[PDB]
Amino acid sequence: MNIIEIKQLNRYFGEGENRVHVLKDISLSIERGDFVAIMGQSGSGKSTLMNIIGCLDTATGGSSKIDGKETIELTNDQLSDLRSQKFGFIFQRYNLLSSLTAAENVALPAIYAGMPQSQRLERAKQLLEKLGLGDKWQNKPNQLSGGQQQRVSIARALMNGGEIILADQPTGALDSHSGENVMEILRQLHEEGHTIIMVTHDKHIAASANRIIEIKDGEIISDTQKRQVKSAVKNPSVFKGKDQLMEAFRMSVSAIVAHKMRSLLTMLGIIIGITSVVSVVALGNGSQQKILENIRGIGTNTMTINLKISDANTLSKQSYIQSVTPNTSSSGILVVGNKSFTSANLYGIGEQYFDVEGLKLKQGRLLTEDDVDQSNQVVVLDESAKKAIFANENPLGKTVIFNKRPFRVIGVVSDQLNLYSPYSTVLNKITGGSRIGSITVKISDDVNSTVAEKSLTELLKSMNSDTIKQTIENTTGTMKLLISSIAFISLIVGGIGVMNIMLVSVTERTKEIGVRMAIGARQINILQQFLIEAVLICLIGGVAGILLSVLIGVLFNSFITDFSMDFSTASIVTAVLFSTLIGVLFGYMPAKKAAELNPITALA
Amino acid sequence: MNIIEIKQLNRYFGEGENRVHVLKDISLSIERGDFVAIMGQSGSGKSTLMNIIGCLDTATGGSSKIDGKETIELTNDQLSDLRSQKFGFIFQRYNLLSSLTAAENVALPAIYAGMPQSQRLERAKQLLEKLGLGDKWQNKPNQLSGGQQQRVSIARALMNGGEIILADQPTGALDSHSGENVMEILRQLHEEGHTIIMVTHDKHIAASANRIIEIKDGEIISDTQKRQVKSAVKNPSVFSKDQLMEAFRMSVSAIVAHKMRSLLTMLGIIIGITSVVSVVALGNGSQQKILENIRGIGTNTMTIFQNLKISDANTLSKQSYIQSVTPNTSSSGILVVGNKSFTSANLYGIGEQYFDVEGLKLKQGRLLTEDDVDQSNQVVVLDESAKKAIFANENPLGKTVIFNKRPFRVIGVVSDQSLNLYSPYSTVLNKITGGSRIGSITVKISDDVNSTVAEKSLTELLKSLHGKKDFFIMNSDTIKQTIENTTGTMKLLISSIAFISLIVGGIGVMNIMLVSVTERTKEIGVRMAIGARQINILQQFLIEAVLICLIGGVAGILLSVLIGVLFNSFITDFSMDFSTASIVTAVLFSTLIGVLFGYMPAKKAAELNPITALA
Ligand SMILES: Nc1ncnc2c1ncn2[C@@H]1O[C@H](COP(=O)(O)OP(=O)(O)OP(=O)(O)O)[C@@H](O)[C@H]1O
Ligand SMILES: Nc1ncnc2c1ncn2[C@@H]1O[C@H](COP(=O)(O)OP(=O)(O)OP(=O)(O)O)[C@@H](O)[C@H]1O
Ligand SMILES: [Mg+2]
Ligand SMILES: [Mg+2]
């Protein structure tokens, strides 16, 4: 019967007293296949009505029915179908996408309809031939005149061949010639069974119409028909209960390439929120290695203990003991030159004593295994007892006399008169007797301290100094807190860094969605390309991230001598899975809230 | 004679093959005061010529002279004057500022002309009356119909009363009534001596002109005059505190209009401060605890291992680069308690402050006082180990020992770090060994003085009072080493992560800023076309920065403060100890960068041709 049936339709804008009655109880039935012109004084409610017809706004009250189906009661996907295939909207202000070419802007409504890419551009190119723009099919909106942008918009409305053609002042910026050709086009579509509803001020234009309504002050004044109207049986209907994503992907890429700055900055914001987190964890763990090492080297942790050499032999066969020393001393008198140093000390020590006490080799060598087996008369000198006896001259080789008994100096060591000879030499050639003073062991770095104090009580029956092993465990807990709490900062920092740039750059195209929704796209078609726009830009900025920090580590480890930046593969994972799980969340959230607005509200 | 003189004017766009010849050797002299209508096909070059006349574009080649003065040779502020006072431009696409009301948009061109704000709104309101929008003077562009937007544009163009009115399809979205009223307005201004150049497609509109030019394919086909032009009297030429006081008011409204952009940018600089500051202060705090844990593992000392007098060690202690001093002298002998008789014990004859020099701390009882060393007392302080062995697990305070058949009264115990015993040096040189010569002198080097400086400062300071040898100075300073060695490592740590976190949050501001302001390069192109001078842009975009920079700065320095308080409260261990040098550095950096990236873009826009900015 009718194709559009509007009864009691009211419309308000504003808050009140800031509110205005814009469409007032207007009741309008438009007959299928008619050619209608709507005229009226500027600001009378014409564009407002056109929107509620094309399902871009929604009326405050009253019914509006397309092919008798109440519009408000349709579903959101059902509406997107109408906008793709029954309606073909020519916007007053033409509403192109600025980043797309002319042709690309025309074909866009036909991607969401789902025709092959090759078919689109040839048709889109023909529509731009019919409307005089075949010359300018590659120009973008801002490379065209207004009258050209207008015709681009006209072509788009005709791309999906919609039954109805809503045309809001579609001649406005056009000369008489270009404007007639446009009326030629619309007339022939009327002739092929299309329905035309056209707002215009030019009368010659309105003459092509068989019906002419006049609106004034939100109400409808005139209603004129030249002829009766041919009857028409309604088209079947346009309702659609994988390739969709191939297209969504292509859109997302072109979108990203179009907005090089927003994209590059966005991804550069993810790049940092990774390399910053990663570089502080790796600088932190590198300065901890050195600091703990600088502490371990200030002295060792040891356990000084019927104590014969087979005790200290089996004691050295553990992995919780890394070195051992039999001990025995002597109090006597030395001689070099005429001088005779009295009450010197000759410490009878073990193979590994200079490892057990962390004394490091200055000059020459330390007591070898041959020296302790043969009870050699060779002495390693204390740094101090070496400078005092030999002034500032090489003492290597030269001899001393402890208890009228020669000793050949073989080396020097550090500190914490002192002399170091084997225990075999002091118990054979200085004191006699087979009993030794004590046994000292160097407890490992990893094993627990108070565990071994009771693991040695057990293992021998079958005192210990450990203040380094304390201030080690004590400063590893401080370096943990430090690294841990600055990693937490740099991570919260660079997440908010992503959020900001992502929130800004996306909301900055809420009108792009509003166009996409008006031209047929379904809600889900938006989320497709805006997720793909995020992950695609997040996991390129992530890759760039993990291997920009790598390059920083190399640069650091090359020029820096003090300590090495040692990376953590846990931080890498954390920082990446965080900076993308946050960038994707804030690239989707805003695009969705837009896609679920009334297109006109999104269009402002 | 002529008010506009355009000879040989050419114009191109693009890069061949993408290049197009748009205005082709067009010569056109327009007589002062005329009413001219330009017509032609869509995309023939009409809007392009209109822009070149109104000084929004500039021709590729040829001359274009307003009042006989060549335009390209004018200065960038001389042009900005023309656009405010000679031209009144009605844009094809109406080009309103979306965040301003209808009235605010119409008055704007009168800021940069410099008229008081109370007169602007009343005139702007009147222009909207004359054009029918007095009803809607508070509506923002997106609360208006297209035709209403159009009339707001027309109103704005008539706000500075410019001599020439360039109208690019001024009636296109208007019914015939509104459209005619607009023609009525233009016609009257013509009568009042204005000059009108109007692009249109409607012919009834074109009739209200005495001169009608038709352009096609960038050339001029038609040139018609109905009546001769009324003779022309040339008009007079038209070429900071307030200026700024207004710019500030624009910047505040601008900021409030873009609440998200603003809050996020300022939140961006908030972090770029609190992050830098909270890592400098977490780092310095953990250094304090780490360096302390090291210093507390032992001291640094210089033992001067005869010719060695107590007056040497007496003068030695009177420095500020020496904190304590000890005379030394030992004894090897035999002890007795009960029936037991411990062989080869050790009795260390030591000084008043020996337990501060080696950092040994007091367990129980007391240490050797000044009375004991002055009287050569027979009192001994016991080693923790030589205390537990001799007295099992019983209080040793008071009870006696016998070193070389000579009693000694125990007075206390010590920390540690054969049997070790501590007695005064006066007691060992009088009551155990005899002789007046001592073993050595040990000094405790101060924490702040350099080590190898003092090793050569005591060689000097003691030589000055004769007594050498010995001076065979040893120096145990491996603690003093492994503090300087980890303070350099903690320096490189806090220094390089403070550099990271700083460069991090500087880019974070750049991103959000470099987007936010380029996001309004068209807003500038409008302001430039509608009168503003180059400097007028930089004014409100600097004030937009500093005003949003030093609020997010204040927010930053005191958000970090609150984090510190939270950290120092819940964490026992190292305290977050702030630096007033980082506070300054971080703030003066995150604002100098946010201001540099708020200004840079705005200034690059404001020097583009207004039309190239409008795209
Ligand atoms: N940036 C650009 N690059 C290439 N060509 C351009 C560019 N801008 C405009 N053009 C072309 O130059 C011509 C200039 O048209 P102009 O802007 O003068 O429109 P017009 O003649 O007023 O048309 P209308 O009446 O439709 O507004 C057009 O043919 C247009 O396609
Ligand atoms: N968001 C809004 N808030 C308040 N009022 C509005 C809003 N949008 C539109 N209006 C008002 O509602 C009326 C309807 O405007 P509409 O766009 O329908 O005009 P129109 O009939 O298309 O006229 P034109 O021929 O100028 O396009 C106008 O008076 C306008 O001022
Ligand atoms: Mg309209
Ligand atoms: Mg134009």
CSV table of C-alpha atoms and ligand atoms in Angstrom, one decimal, chain A residues 136 139 142-149 151 173-175, chain B residues 13-14 18-23 40-49 51 92-93 168-169 199 201 215, ligand 1:
chain,number,residue,atom,x,y,z
A,136,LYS,CA,38.4,12.6,-10.7
A,139,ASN,CA,40.9,12.5,-5.9
A,142,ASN,CA,39.7,17.6,0.0
A,143,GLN,CA,41.0,17.6,-3.6
A,144,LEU,CA,37.5,18.3,-5.0
A,145,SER,CA,35.1,21.2,-5.3
A,146,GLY,CA,32.0,21.3,-3.2
A,147,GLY,CA,29.9,20.5,-6.2
A,148,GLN,CA,32.1,17.5,-6.9
A,149,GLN,CA,32.0,16.3,-3.3
A,151,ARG,CA,28.1,14.4,-6.7
A,173,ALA,CA,26.1,23.3,-4.8
A,174,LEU,CA,25.5,22.3,-8.4
A,175,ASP,CA,25.1,24.4,-11.6
B,13,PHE,CA,47.6,21.9,-7.9
B,14,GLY,CA,49.4,18.6,-7.5
B,18,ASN,CA,48.7,14.2,-10.3
B,19,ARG,CA,49.0,17.9,-11.4
B,20,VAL,CA,46.1,20.0,-12.7
B,21,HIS,CA,46.0,23.4,-14.3
B,22,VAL,CA,43.1,25.1,-12.5
B,23,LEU,CA,43.2,28.9,-13.3
B,40,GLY,CA,30.2,28.6,-14.2
B,41,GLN,CA,30.3,24.8,-14.0
B,42,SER,CA,31.1,22.9,-10.9
B,43,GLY,CA,34.9,22.7,-10.4
B,44,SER,CA,35.8,25.4,-13.0
B,45,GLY,CA,38.1,27.4,-10.6
B,46,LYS,CA,35.6,29.8,-9.0
B,47,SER,CA,36.3,29.1,-5.3
B,48,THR,CA,40.0,29.0,-6.2
B,49,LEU,CA,40.0,32.6,-7.6
B,51,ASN,CA,40.5,32.5,-2.2
B,92,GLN,CA,31.2,27.8,0.6
B,93,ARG,CA,31.4,25.1,3.2
B,168,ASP,CA,31.1,32.0,-2.3
B,169,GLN,CA,27.6,30.6,-3.0
B,199,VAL,CA,29.9,33.2,-6.8
B,201,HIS,CA,24.5,29.3,-9.7
B,215,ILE,CA,34.3,30.9,-15.8
C,1,LIG,N1,44.2,19.8,-3.8
C,1,LIG,C1,43.8,19.6,-5.1
C,1,LIG,N2,44.5,18.8,-6.0
C,1,LIG,C2,44.2,18.6,-7.3
C,1,LIG,N3,43.1,19.3,-7.8
C,1,LIG,C3,42.3,20.1,-7.0
C,1,LIG,C4,42.7,20.3,-5.6
C,1,LIG,N4,41.8,21.2,-5.1
C,1,LIG,C5,40.9,21.5,-6.1
C,1,LIG,N5,41.2,20.8,-7.3
C,1,LIG,C6,40.5,20.9,-8.6
C,1,LIG,O1,40.6,22.2,-9.1
C,1,LIG,C7,39.3,22.7,-9.4
C,1,LIG,C8,39.1,23.9,-8.5
C,1,LIG,O2,37.7,23.9,-8.1
C,1,LIG,P1,37.1,25.0,-7.1
C,1,LIG,O3,37.6,24.7,-5.8
C,1,LIG,O4,37.3,26.4,-7.8
C,1,LIG,O5,35.5,24.7,-7.2
C,1,LIG,P2,34.4,25.5,-7.9
C,1,LIG,O6,34.8,25.9,-9.3
C,1,LIG,O7,33.9,26.6,-7.0
C,1,LIG,O8,33.3,24.3,-8.0
C,1,LIG,P3,31.8,24.3,-7.2
C,1,LIG,O9,30.9,25.2,-8.0
C,1,LIG,O10,31.5,22.8,-7.4
C,1,LIG,O11,32.1,24.7,-5.8
C,1,LIG,C9,38.4,21.6,-9.4
C,1,LIG,O12,38.2,21.0,-10.7
C,1,LIG,C10,39.1,20.6,-8.5
C,1,LIG,O13,38.9,19.2,-8.9
